Write a protein that binds this ligand. Sequence first.
Ligand code: DAU
Ligand code: DAU
Ligand code: 1YA
Ligand code: 1YA
Lengths: 271, 274
Amino acid sequence: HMIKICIAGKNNIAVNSLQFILKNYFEADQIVVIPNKNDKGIDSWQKSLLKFALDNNIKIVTLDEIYNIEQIIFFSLEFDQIIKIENFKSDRLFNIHFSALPKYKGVFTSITPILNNELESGVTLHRIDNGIDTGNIIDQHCFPIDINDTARDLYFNYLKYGESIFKKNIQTIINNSYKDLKQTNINSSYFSRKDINLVHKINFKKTSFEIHNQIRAFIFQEYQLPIINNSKIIKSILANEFIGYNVFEEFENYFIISGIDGFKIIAQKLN
Amino acid sequence: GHMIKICIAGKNNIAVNSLQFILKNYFEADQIVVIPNKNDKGIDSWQKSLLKFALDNNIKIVTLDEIYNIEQIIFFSLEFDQIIKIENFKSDRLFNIHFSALPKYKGVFTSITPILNNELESGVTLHRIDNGIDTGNIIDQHCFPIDINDTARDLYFNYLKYGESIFKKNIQTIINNSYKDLKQTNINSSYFSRKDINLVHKINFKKTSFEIHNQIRAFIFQEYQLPIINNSKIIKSILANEFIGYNVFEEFENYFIISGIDGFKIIAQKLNKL
Ligand SMILES: Cc1cn([C@H]2C[C@H](O)[C@@H](COP(=O)(O)OP(=O)(O)O[C@H]3O[C@H](CO)[C@@H](O)[C@H](O)[C@H]3O)O2)c(=O)[nH]c1=O
Ligand SMILES: Cc1cn([C@H]2C[C@H](O)[C@@H](COP(=O)(O)OP(=O)(O)O[C@H]3O[C@H](CO)[C@@H](O)[C@H](O)[C@H]3O)O2)c(=O)[nH]c1=O
Ligand SMILES: Nc1nc2c(c(=O)[nH]1)N[C@H](CN(C=O)c1ccc(C(=O)N[C@@H](CCC(=O)O)C(=O)O)cc1)CN2
Ligand SMILES: Nc1nc2c(c(=O)[nH]1)N[C@H](CN(C=O)c1ccc(C(=O)N[C@@H](CCC(=O)O)C(=O)O)cc1)CN2
């Protein structure tokens, strides 16, 4: 068919990966795009896929419009819809998921690995099957969650590494010469929206590492910041200085906190 | 200096067998004292009673107050139920075996917490006691697997086993005071209190098969409780690699068949099964 590829989703990973295909592989007339339902068609703190496509004379389609395109490559890059694979003639359906699968299937993956005490995360390119982030893994890139990284910092890492893993593998996908491996049952985890209360209530009867992690997992200013006694927190810093157990002291610009193991946290208040 | 050399404080097979080992190999009975836990009524049940062993072997029962002034005494907590304040003691030879791979899973119910948090292994850790909970310097650790179908009960019996073993491995160097240790790191340190665990766990099925399995088996410890699914007590959970479709739930006379979001088969065996 004339149309070779659909890019579906949002943000700079989608925009940049589309730019890369336009520059290196396919002409506009060979590409269609499905923006997310919330795409305003203007750039914000991320670029708009809708705007990029219109600016570049790529057609905006719906899923209904591509299901019958033989051999189309369908590529989800932060797409907001669950696919049903039997809708499609093509079986060339792919996603980049922002975690180190099989762990942290589902949502809010800039939050969940932090909240669960992980030292690393990853991006994973996989085939789409009918389950949520369950299909066979094509490629994965693991990277650290540094000790004072926030959810926002981690999200910007997913965008960066996600764009790179796209570029690394896209020719094998286009050539249908990639290899994949089924995901294991062990280590598989999943979160849905119901599992995370974005207005997090910190549990201080925890270690310093855990309290620190509770704070920084919710630091993502475009959405929210965690609040301690009515002040928003912009950064948490965990040190291995021992300051005594269960410290909590509020100052004008920051809190000094330690948990049951007495390591020092500085929780910096938003200016 | 003093006649008393060692105090064993705590409960269950670990305390009893450790005490038996020192009495056989290291100290006579008049050199040893014991502090049972508050709920020890001196009756052997599914674990042995430390109080009963002491009574049966003429090893004196004491309180912490009676040992604080014993210089050089070796104090060992083997599932002890009291928090120590090290400044009460003249001796600095104060030790604990905690049932986890520290620094993870400080605090309570460590037969439940690693399972519920999706771990594949656990451990026992011999440490110095400081004024924090399970925070003192590590002397030795032995890690072991949590087998995929282990229950909390199964994991508790492995702690008893490996815990008794790590005591024997280290006791000579404690007695000769030549042991080495290392400060715990801040990174990976985790802690649970009784408030963080609801022993009447309501299963979240909007999870992976692995996670649903873990949620069930983490609460299987029949002396205390069993998890309940559709008003049936569950005695065992078995997780397989077989794909059966997403979000399966079917009740049979003797078991449930369950899968989560990733569609792996779980068999949850009912207690009523003959
Ligand atoms: C909405 C929201 C998001 N965030 C943070 C954590 C999220 O990981 C990150 C990105 O948010 P979203 O893109 O809305 O949602 P997230 O669950 O990460 O993304 C999933 O759901 C998105 C919306 O359905 C899909 O477009 C993505 O493909 C899918 O991966 O921003 C917050 O901290 N607070 C928020 O309220
Ligand atoms: C009381 C209770 C226990 N358990 C299981 C899981 C526990 O890890 C295991 C042992 O129970 P306990 O010895 O009462 O509690 P546990 O938190 O494991 O032990 C801590 O607390 C004990 C009581 O303070 C201390 O004596 C120990 O040194 C300490 O390690 O039994 C249950 O599954 N349900 C229960 O209701
Ligand atoms: N079938 C399928 N569709 C896929 C992917 C997948 O692996 N498989 N990857 C992406 C997965 N995805 C985003 O990357 C995506 C988008 C929307 C929702 C969604 O509708 N979420 C609800 C859950 C609804 C439900 O319970 O089924 C939520 O958590 O509240 C979920 C995931 C895009 N579509
Ligand atoms: N200071 C300290 N004491 C220790 C250990 C330790 O690492 N540090 N290890 C063990 C930790 N432990 C179990 O392994 C354990 C037991 C009870 C409580 C506790 O908090 N107990 C009582 C107060 C005790 C009393 O003074 O009578 C309570 O809260 O009711 C805390 C930890 C035994 N004691």
